[PDB]
Design a protein around this ligand. Structure first.
Ligand SMILES: CCCCCCCCCCCC
Ligand SMILES: CCCCCCCCCCCC
Ligand SMILES: CCCCCCCCCCCC
Ligand SMILES: CCCCCCCC
Ligand SMILES: CCCCCCCC
Ligand SMILES: CCCCCCCC
Ligand SMILES: CCCCCC
Ligand SMILES: CCCCC
Ligand SMILES: [K+]
Ligand SMILES: [K+]
Ligand SMILES: [K+]
Ligand SMILES: [K+]
Ligand SMILES: [K+]
Lengths: 273, 252
């Protein structure tokens, strides 16, 4: 029980650190997003009134009700228009493959989701069984890429031999060339093909490879066949790379935390001599 | 390259999943699209005020509206939690360039930090369990019995009760409830169902649950991976047996 007390102490401290991290993030996010939210809400009410007064026809609750039915279609995509009344399949051959990949990688873009009860129960079991299997594949791809690196890093460190300070150089080259291969090039290719901006491109890259997946940006969701498989294969390899990067960042965080712990101890003991 | 063989396994898993998903979803898709065209014509004929060209403009502004409509005091906190947990429901996402760059750095730094918190909560809950499970196992294939009890009581506490509480408070069905539970606690988070969306003691409990349930689901998924590895090492020797016997027979 001696170590359990210290363990609970550490866990509580981490908990509070994360809570305050969330508080800071929430403040920054609301202070960065609520202004445009209010602008959009006021302009949307403006256009609502403009269309209501121009067509005071019977609607009102029918109008909000129509936007509500529009909302249900919206999630699956409201695509009802006089031109192009023929639609495309969000569940065609490759789309369901795309969806299964999102499910197993726990990305879950959500741009397309199952509506059938059977579809939902399936997706449940399919995830419960695929997440670990895909974990195995990911760990393997990780190992493979790590050895592919170790080879080239043993090649690159021999030339720089003109121990304790060489690992810094190797990690620098690792992060550099990785951000090149798994962040820069795919982001530029997306900017081109998908028509995104540089920001949007790198932001989609990061949100995908971190397994967050918001859904705002998807490489295979717009109606704009060698691109999609390469994108998914990237997603896999980039996921391995980002696992490595996040592990390094966590190591750095632990180092900084245990450094500031002794810093605070120092400050407490001295109190200005 | 054992991993390459697994790669083919996973690709085949994806193909099977894709077939099942399309055969489970494309019918409802066609039904919904036909009913949507029906309702389009119905709304046009019921209101000859709105013309063919007038409806398209509203549906276009609505599509633009879907990207926007939030960000209140607690909503941004919930969003930060989704970001750090890699859930990413997406119901609310940053639109500002500054918001996007922030969210990027915020995730890159919170994901590992939250990982530390999660590992701590995990260890703690694992020991909390170990106490009672060693107490019952001393009195009592025994690891099999214990794992059964673990999975049972875990599904109870972190799946059943929260799913029923959601069914009640949020107005969902039993299926939808368990489906949201699983999609959240697997860190998938599609966005179709959100507990703190669709607009102050419910939401904080929801997030703290999310945390504890995530620990529980990590444990469950690791166990499932162990079972998969066991079954794989069983079928490897099964295939070895079969090949050795087919060869013994082909000798004759
Ligand atoms: C070593 C090759 C470097 C080529 C420089 C490419 C610059 C193109 C601009 C890319 C961002 C739009
Ligand atoms: C859930 C559907 C996946 C079934 C995969 C087939 C199982 C055998 C894989 C190949 C064995 C050599
Ligand atoms: C119901 C499916 C159970 C097995 C799923 C795939 C694992 C089978 C063996 C895979 C490696 C040979
Ligand atoms: C965001 C930096 C927090 C530093 C905390 C130091 C000890 C609570
Ligand atoms: C501010 C809410 C006014 C009512 C809006 C109802 C949906 C159009
Ligand atoms: C557009 C520049 C993004 C830099 C991200 C910073 C990550 C530490
Ligand atoms: C479903 C195949 C399992 C075989 C176990 C020996
Ligand atoms: C923004 C009002 C709540 C502060 C604790
Ligand atoms: K997601
Ligand atoms: K995830
Ligand atoms: K999502
Ligand atoms: K994860
Ligand atoms: K996710």
């Amino acid at each position: 029980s001696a170590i359990n007390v210290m363990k609970w102490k550490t866990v509580s401290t981490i908990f509070l650190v994360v809570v305050l991290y969330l508080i800071i993030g929430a403040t920054v996010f609301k202070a960065l997003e609520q202004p445009q939210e209010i602008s959009q809400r006021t302009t949307i009410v403006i256009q609502r009134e403009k269309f209501l007064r121009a067509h005071p026809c019977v609607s009102d609750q029918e109008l909000d009700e129509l936007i509500q039915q529009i909302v249900a279609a919206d999630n699956a995509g409201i695509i009802p228009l006089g031109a192009s009344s023929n639609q495309v399949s969000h569940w065609d051959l490759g789309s369901s493959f795309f969806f299964a990949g999102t499910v197993i990688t726990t990305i879950g873009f959500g741009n397309i989701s199952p509506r059938t009860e059977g579809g939902k129960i399936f997706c449940i079991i399919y995830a419960l069984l695929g997440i670990p299997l895909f974990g195995f594949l990911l760990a393997g791809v990780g190992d493979q890429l790590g050895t592919i690196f170790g080879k080239g890093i043993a090649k690159v460190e021999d030339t720089f031999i003109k121990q304790t300070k060489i690992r810094i150089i190797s990690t620098i080259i690792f992060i550099l060339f990785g951000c090149v291969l798994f962040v820069a090039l795919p982001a530029v290719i997306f900017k081109h093909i998908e028509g995104w901006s540089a920001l949007d491109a790198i932001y989609f890259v990061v949100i995908t490879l971190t397994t967050i997946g918001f859904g705002d940006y998807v490489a295979g969701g717009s109606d704009i066949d060698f691109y999609k498989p390469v994108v998914w294969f990237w997603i896999l390899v980039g996921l391995a790379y980002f696992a490595a990067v996040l592990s390094m960042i966590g190591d750095w965080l632990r180092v900084i935390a245990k450094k500031t712990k002794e810093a605070v101890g120092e400050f407490r003991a001295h109190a200005a001599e």
